Chains A and B, each alone.
Chain A
Amino acid sequence: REIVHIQAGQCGNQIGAKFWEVISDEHGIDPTGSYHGDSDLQLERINVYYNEATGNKYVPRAILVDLEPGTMDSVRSGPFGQIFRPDNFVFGQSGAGNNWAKGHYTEGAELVDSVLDVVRKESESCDCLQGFQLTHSLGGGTGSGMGTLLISKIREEYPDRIMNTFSVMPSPKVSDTVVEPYNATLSVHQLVENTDETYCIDNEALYDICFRTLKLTTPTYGDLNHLVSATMSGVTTCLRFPGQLNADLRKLAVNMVPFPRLHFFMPGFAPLTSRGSQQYRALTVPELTQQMFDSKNMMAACDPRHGRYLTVAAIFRGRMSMKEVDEQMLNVQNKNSSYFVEWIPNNVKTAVCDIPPRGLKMSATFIGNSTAIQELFKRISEQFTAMFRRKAFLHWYTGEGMDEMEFTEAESNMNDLVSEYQQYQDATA
Chain B
Amino acid sequence: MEVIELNKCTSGQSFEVILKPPSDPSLEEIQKKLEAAEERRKYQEAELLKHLAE
Contact = CB atoms under 8 A, between A and B. Distances in A.
Interface string A395-421: 000000000000000000000000000
Given A155-B52, A156-B52, A159-B48, 5 more contacts: A152-B52, A155-B48, A156-B49, A159-B45, A159-B49
Nearest to A194: B52
A156 B45 CA distance: 10
8 contacts: A152-B52, A155-B48, A155-B52, A156-B49, A156-B52, A159-B45, A159-B48, A159-B49
Contacts of A156: 49, 52
Contacts, number: 8
User: Would you call the interface of chain B mostly helix, strand, loop, or mixed?
Assistant: helix
Interface in B1-54: 45, 48-49, 52
A16 B36 CA distance: 43
Interface in A142-176: 152, 155-156, 159
A337 B52 CA distance: 42
Interface string A230-252: 00000000000000000000000
Contacts of A152: 52
Q: Size range of the interface on A?
A: under 10
Interface of A: 152, 155-156, 159
A144 to B, nearest CB: 19
Contacts of B52: 152, 155-156
A194 to B, nearest CB: 9
Nearest to B48: A159
Nearest to A152: B52
A159 B48 CA distance: 9
A152 B54 CA distance: 12
B49 to A, nearest CB: 7
Contacts of B45: 159
A159 B42 CA distance: 12
A156 B49 CA distance: 6
Nearest to B41: A160
A104 B52 CA distance: 14
Nearest to B51: A193
A77 B41 CA distance: 47
A156 B54 CA distance: 12
B28 to A, nearest CB: 28
A162 to B, nearest CB: 15
Contacts of B48: 155, 159
A156 B52 CA distance: 7
A153 to B, nearest CB: 9
A351 B47 CA distance: 37
Nearest to B45: A159
Contacts of A155: 48, 52
Nearest to A193: B51
Interface-centre pick from B48, B49, B52 (highest chain A CB count, 10 A): B52
A122 B41 CA distance: 27
A156 B53 CA distance: 9
A403 to B, nearest CB: 16
A155 B49 CA distance: 9
B51 to A, nearest CB: 8
A158 to B, nearest CB: 12
A132 to B, nearest CB: 16
